[PDB]
Amino acid sequence: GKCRGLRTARKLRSHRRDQKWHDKQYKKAHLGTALKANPFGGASHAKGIVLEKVGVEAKQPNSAIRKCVRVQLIKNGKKITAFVPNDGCLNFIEENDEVLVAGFGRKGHAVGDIPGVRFKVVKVANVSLLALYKGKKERPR
Template sequence: KKNTMGKPRGIRAGRKLRNLRREERWADKGYKKAHLGTALKANPFGGASHAKGIVLEKIGIEAKQPNSAIRKCVRVQLIKNGKRIAAFVPRDGCLNFVEENDEVLIAGFGRKGHAVGDIPGVRFKVVKVSR
């Protein structure tokens, strides 16, 4: 029976199989993100899990449809590279603990660099406030 399509199945086809697998891996989104290095350059944290920043202003971001709310966020300038990001302030009334020019610790929001829920464009959250 002749193998017209598909992978080689011969006893000495190991190198060919390995090379094909290596080429096809680039179609995998996660592999490409990890190995190209462009995602790391675009990441404001530069590969770190947390980052410190200075609060520039408090902002209210409108929730996406069908929800109607103003999500309390802060505009933060990171200390390590000067990039400005928006960070969500979680829990009820916690925006009252944050003032402008405070130093805050920022972490990711939990979806590997994507915005969460109904808050558009916000990929980070405040985890600690130090005056």
Template sequence: MARGEFSARSQEKKRKKWKKKNPKEKIRSKRKQKKLKDILEGSPQARGIVLEKRGVTARQPNSGIRKCVRVQLIKNGKQLTALAPYDGAIKFIDEHDEVLIEGGGGRKKGAKGDLWGVKFKVIKVNNQSLEMLRKGKKEKVKR
């Protein structure tokens, strides 16, 4: 390795080469090149309109139908599938309701648990907390 007075260029070249091998640096460079796109466009939450309710089957070794909703985001028009968490939460979500979506809690912005491709969950319906609706502390507002 060159260590002389005028060796800065060669040292920068070597540093650049090794930097490309770092996994975090790979993600950062892909994001700069717009190859790795986040559907929420960097924000932690987004509002959307419910298009339909659907059941997603859990993958092996679990079994069961997880209650999910298909949502179209207001800010960019993209569609995604979001989980209606906890018991009986799907009853409070109807088609054409406005919902607030946040990340589902999986590692590296991925799916959580036994659901393929479901990376988001519903936290509010028509500006009412889904948890409060579920517990019966609030009533659903008609829009």
């Protein structure tokens, strides 16, 4: 069992330190290779330039063609497939426009129906998609 002496503190804490790495969450947060491989670079939102639009096929049970947009991040030049959130919102987005992109909400997991997309477009040309969808804004170019 567990060592239960009174002069055994360094063994207990060294054992704890070595066994904290096998926790994948603590290793992901503290070893920090997922922090460098993150396209956002530990950022809540990123800003890119639209490169093309791709219709990606969904999972096998739910058949749909989700209209993702391939953008190039201004920061480090990584290619991002970001899902345009709502229906009819693919119409507003246009090639070579400055775009603000956020994740879906599983902290780095392809959420649900779409393999390879864990990002969603929030803003285009410094106006939101929610304003354009609800008839609140006029899009500049």
